[PDB]
Amino acid sequence: SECVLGQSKRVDFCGKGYHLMSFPQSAPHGVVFLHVTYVPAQEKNFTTA
Amino acid sequence: LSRLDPPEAEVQIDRLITGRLQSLQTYVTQQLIRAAEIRASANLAATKM
What we know:
The structure is cut from a larger assembly and holds two copies of chain A.
Chain A: E1 19-27, E2 30-37
Antiparallel strand pairs in A: 1-2
């Protein structure tokens, strides 16, 4: 009720990374959560004023 | 078992052996709700982790 319903703000509480959305699946005596996170890969340096 | 005889020791052994593992019964309950006090404080660590 805070990852599947709704778009949370809680990292390490809705998977690993900035939580996007959540797909639940049934399981024998279990619940399985998929997670979608926005975790970018490639960067640089940059220079400010 | 040695001094008391198994006819009239059996009501003594009635709640000697049946009662002794009732004392880590104490201990694990003392354990886990310090452990689950931290297993959720894991999640409370995970709040600002």
